[PDB]
Amino acid sequence: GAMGMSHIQIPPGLTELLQGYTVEVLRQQPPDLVEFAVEYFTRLREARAPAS
Amino acid sequence: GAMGMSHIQIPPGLTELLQGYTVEVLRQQPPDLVEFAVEYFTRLREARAPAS
């Protein structure tokens, strides 16, 4: 972020999760980040689609 | 050994394009991480065209 938090940075949760998952793409499958992510997140939706 | 250093080469543009999509989808007001992430990386995928 920028020094002096007057210039607000918006981290609505997805941002930190996104970073974690972007590390997942980078660490697990460096050449193709997206194919891994797509499979991982489709698997995510598959395994856990929000049920209330 | 002589080689073996994990030289994680991340292709630039991954971030840039999924950034365009992140800001756009955030503007779309995404529901949950599952659908958010699926479409997000899917948008890169849609732009790259895995099928033709």
Binding site: I10, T22, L26, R27 | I8, I10, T22
Partner: peptide, 28 residues
Amino acid sequence: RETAEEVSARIVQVVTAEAVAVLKGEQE
């Protein structure tokens, strides 16, 4: 004053760059 566009860009940028730095163990 800051925008989603630029922060989101920063966030994805720093994670890829820094996680790349993690490959060497920059995190120490």
